Design a protein around this ligand. Structure first.
Ligand SMILES: OC[C@@H]1CC2(CCC2)CN1c1ncnc2[nH]ccc12
Length: 167
């Protein structure tokens, strides 16, 4: 039993809800919140910009030190950093950005990072400003993640469409 509330159950382990991931994380304070990151951890817009603003830019400060030490992530890769005031840990995961020409096949690799954590609050990777089809992002998530994932979908039109089209 965990403290996630109001989710629709899609499969044995994947749940989905219409919610702002920032407000969800502040309420639940999960062990792991997933960020929709880029390889430079420049948290400018989308989910990443929203999560960072909620930390008063502390996420960006920590991220810049991480990059200065380790260099950029790989597309499809991830790193674990602090969850600041939002969660115990933030898993920064790089889904492909279709608007940069990145291979959509790397989306499965991105979701595989979730399997290293027993429970996560997460967005749909590569959705939104990353330019991939959110219906596709959901299918890959369901077919790749085996740990317990609670998906926060920002757009009502998307959320209702995601639910009504789910196979
Ligand atoms: O697939 C990620 C989706 C796609 C997006 C562009 C249209 C809606 C942003 N995003 C979010 N998902 C959950 N919580 C969020 N909080 C702030 C942004 C955000």
């Amino acid at each position: 039993v965990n403290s996630f509330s109001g989710y629709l159950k899609l499969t044995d382990n994947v749940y989905i809800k219409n919610a702002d991931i920032v407000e969800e994380a502040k309420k639940v304070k999960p062990t792991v919140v997933v960020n929709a990151a880029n390889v430079y951890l420049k948290h400018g817009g989308g989910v990443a910009g929203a999560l960072n603003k909620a930390t008063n830019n502390a996420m960006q400060v920590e991220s810049d030190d991480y990059i200065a030490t380790n260099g950029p992530l790989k597309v499809g890769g991830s790193c674990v950093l602090s969850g600041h005031n939002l969660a115990k840990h933030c898993l920064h995961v790089v889904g492909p950005n279709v608007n940069k020409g990145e291979d959509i096949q790397l989306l499965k690799s991105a979701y595989e990072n979730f399997n290293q954590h027993e429970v996560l609050l997460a967005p749909l990777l590569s959705a939104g400003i990353f330019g991939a089809d959110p219906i596709h992002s959901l299918r890959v998530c369901v077919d790749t993640v085996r740990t317990n994932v609670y998906l926060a979908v920002f757009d009502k039109n998307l959320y209702d469409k995601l639910v009504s089209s789910f196979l």
